[PDB]
Amino acid sequence: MDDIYKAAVEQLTEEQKNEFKAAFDIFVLGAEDGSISTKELGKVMRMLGQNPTPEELQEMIDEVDEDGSGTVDFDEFLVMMVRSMKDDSKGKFKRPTLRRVRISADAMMQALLGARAKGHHHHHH
Numbered sequence: 001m002d003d004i005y006k007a008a009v010e011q012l013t014e015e016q017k018n019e020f021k022a023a024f025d026i027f028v029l030g031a032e033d034g035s036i037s038t039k040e041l042g043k044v045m046r047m048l049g050q051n052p053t054p055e056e057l058q059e060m061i062d063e064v065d066e067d068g069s070g071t072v073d074f075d076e077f078l079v080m081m082v083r084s085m086k087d088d089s090k091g092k093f094k095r096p097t098l099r100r101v102r103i104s105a106d107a108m109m110q111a112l113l114g115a116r117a118k119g120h121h122h123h124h125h
């Protein structure tokens with residue numbers, strides 16, 4: 001649980017955080033615990049056209065699930081937003097090439113919110 005990102009979460013205004021909060025629920029949409037797990041993570045991942053396996057999804061979850069809970073709650077997910085928000089291009093490794101390869105937060109959230117902010121009508125199945 002990075003403290004710098006922790007502050008980032010608190011930094012997000014009520015409105016900005018609200019939008020991010022919506023994305024959080026989307027990942028766990030239908031989650032009994034409400035925590036974003038590999039299963040709750042892949043669901044949204046598929047929404048963006050991603051088809052990551054649960055076993056591999058665990059790595060993505062761990063990205064923000066430093067607690068080893070296996071699930072990224074609101075705070076854990078919110079960190080993800082700040083993780084790529086303040087991270088222009090830095091990682092523990094992930095080899096060379098677009099040092100980021102992070103779930104396109106831009107469109108990612110757009111899919112969860114179904115286009116919340118004018119523009120396209122929404123989405124089409």
Ligand SMILES: O=C(O)CCCCCCNS(=O)(=O)c1cccc2c(Cl)cccc12
Binds near residue numbers: 057060061064083101
């Ligand atoms: O061409 C390929 O085979 C790669 C397919 C693309 C999959 C990579 C994205 N995987 S991901 O689950 O969307 C993901 C990546 C990085 C950080 C994350 C955090 Cl902090 C939270 C939740 C998910 C995160």
Ligand SMILES: [Ca+2]
Binds near residue numbers: 065066067068073
């Ligand atoms: Ca956790």
